[PDB]
């Protein structure tokens, strides 16, 4: 009957598996039953009740010491956005850092009139980029250079427009008004059509490796094994030349050009998919049948979009545009909805990216701020100081040590033993200890050359690393802790800020 041989058989026996922790594989039917037909546990799940474990190896209970008040848990009473401590944002993925702020003005507030009493705001515009991918792309090419020269070059602007799907630029448009649905749909359709009429045939990436996430390890990913290969770069380049070999500088991406953004194709296809915005968001006249109704993203009648709701437009590679949304107010009551996800529409991703960070964007301040912030994750720092780096360009972490003022006393100054690090650089002691460290390193380089396709070369490099570590360690025990500090600062002030 109703696919009795097809909706049964446990959909290909549910031969797609997962992987939890210690290699245990579970079926998707089992996991779907766990989230669907196990609602008692879900009653606890939507109550944030604390339970606390017991120690299993203890004869007498003894509730295990936990600190569970994590950022998401404590933030459930806040409004708008959650709040973490940086380390918890480093965990739970959370790798899309903010690169720019903006606004979609109806009437732009003038500093004249009455302070700006004509300042009607339709949306608040924020742009977010994947910071590790921003580092890996814009940092190994545009890293260690003058940032003003980089942002002055029109090649950097072209590159941050081209590599936008690669960075996964997601734009959050938060409604600052009870906006009518038809007006917003017409405005977005008109703006995106205007930007589609100027989307010339331009450059897109091409795939260098297929597959990943086969239907047995849907929990797993291929990139850590790809980046921790026995030869890595050699293997990656070999894959590259067997398809699209990188022509650019140290960035990857082969960049096919022109035709990739076809005109009568995907551009016109997107000009039709935009026509199926006011017949997919505001269909035939019945404000209870319009898809976005009932949910908190609109009002009770569904006519207007409520103030505080946000629309998340993420530009995936291969022309994928993911439009999600999120209601406003208390985050403990916020509900997030996936609205649409289009794939293969290379004109939509390029048109949205041009509309946000183009030569004429929807907000020039947002485009300039995003293209200017992006060098901070490019230089291996992230937009917000999640790693608590003291040398951050903006929002640097402090050492937490009171600054010292030299007193006009004599009893405070004591001539103790060898318990001061060297602070005078360029002196005879520093120069002679640098010379002794130099001869120790030269002995290490000489000893690493006697340690005797690319996998055997990397094994030889590992053997040379072991011999160099042995010789350098013996030399550093011959020298002092000040020499250890000098080797540490020499290693620190020699690598590029990008981390290459």
């Amino acid at each position: 009957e109703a696919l009795l041989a097809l909706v049964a058989q446990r959909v290909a026996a549910e031969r797609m598996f997962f992987t939890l922790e210690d290699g245990s594989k579970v079926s998707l039917w089992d996991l779907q039953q766990y989230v669907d037909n196990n609602p008692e546990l879900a009653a606890l799940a939507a109550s944030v009740r604390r339970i606390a474990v017991a120690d299993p190896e203890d004869p007498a209970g003894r509730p295990l010491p936990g600190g569970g008040a994590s950022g998401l848990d404590r933030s459930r009473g806040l409004t708008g956005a959650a709040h973490m401590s940086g380390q918890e944002a480093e965990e739970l993925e959370l790798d899309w850092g903010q690169v720019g702020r903006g606004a979609l003005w109806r009437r732009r507030p003038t500093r004249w009139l009455l302070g700006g009493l004509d300042g009607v705001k339709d949306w608040e515009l924020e742009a977010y980029a994947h910071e590790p991918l921003a580092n890996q792309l814009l940092g190994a090419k545009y890293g260690g250079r003058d940032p003003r020269a980089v942002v002055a070059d029109p090649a950097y602007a072209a590159d941050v427009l081209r590599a936008g799907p690669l960075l996964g630029m997601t734009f959050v448009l938060r409604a600052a008004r009870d906006l009518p649905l038809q007006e917003v749909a017409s405005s977005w359709r008109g703006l995106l059509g205007n930007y589609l009429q100027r989307q010339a045939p331009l450059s897109l990436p091409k795939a260098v490796r297929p597959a990943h996430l086969d239907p047995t390890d849907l929990n797993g990913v291929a990139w850590p094994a790809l980046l921790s290969r026995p030869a890595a770069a050699a293997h990656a380049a070999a894959e590259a030349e067997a398809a699209g070999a990188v022509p650019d500088d140290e960035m990857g991406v082969a960049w096919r050009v022109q035709s990739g953004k076809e005109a009568a194709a995907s551009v016109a296809a997107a000009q039709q998919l935009l026509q199926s915005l006011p017949d997919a968001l505001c269909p035939g006249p019945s404000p209870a049948a319009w898809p976005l109704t009932g949910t908190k993203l609109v009002d009770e009648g569904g006519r207007n979009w409520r103030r505080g709701g946000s629309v998340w437009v993420t530009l995936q590679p291969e022309g994928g545009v993911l439009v999600q949304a999120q209601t406003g107010g208390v985050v403990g009551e916020q509900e997030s909805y996936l609205l649409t996800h289009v794939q293969g529409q290379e004109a939509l991703a390029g048109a949205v990216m041009s509309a946000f960070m183009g030569p004429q964007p929807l907000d020039p301040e947002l485009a300039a701020a995003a293209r200017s912030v992006l060098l901070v994750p490019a230089n291996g720092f992230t937009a917000a100081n999640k790693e608590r780096d003291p040398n951050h360009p903006l929002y640097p972490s402090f050492t937490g040590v009171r600054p010292g003022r030299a007193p006009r006393d004599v009893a405070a100054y004591t001539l103790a033993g060898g318990r001061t690090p060297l602070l005078a650089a360029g002196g005879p002691g520093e120069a002679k200890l640098a010379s002794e460290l130099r001869t120790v390193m030269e002995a290490a380089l000489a000893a690493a050359a006697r340690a005797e396709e690319a996998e055997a070369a990397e094994a030889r490099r590992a053997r040379g690393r072991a011999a160099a570590a042995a010789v350098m360690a013996e030399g550093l025990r011959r020298l002092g802790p000040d020499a250890v500090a000098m080797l540490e600062r020499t290693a620190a002030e020699a690598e590029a800020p990008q981390g290459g």
């Binding site: 009870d178 009002d299 009648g301």
Partner: peptide, 21 residues
């Protein structure tokens, strides 16, 4: 007294703003 049954969803926000009462 009057029969003008106006409909608006911002009146809920106004009633919530009457928490000052």
């Amino acid at each position: 007294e009057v029969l003008l049954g106006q409909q608006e969803a911002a009146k809920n926000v106004a009633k919530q703003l009457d928490e000052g009462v």
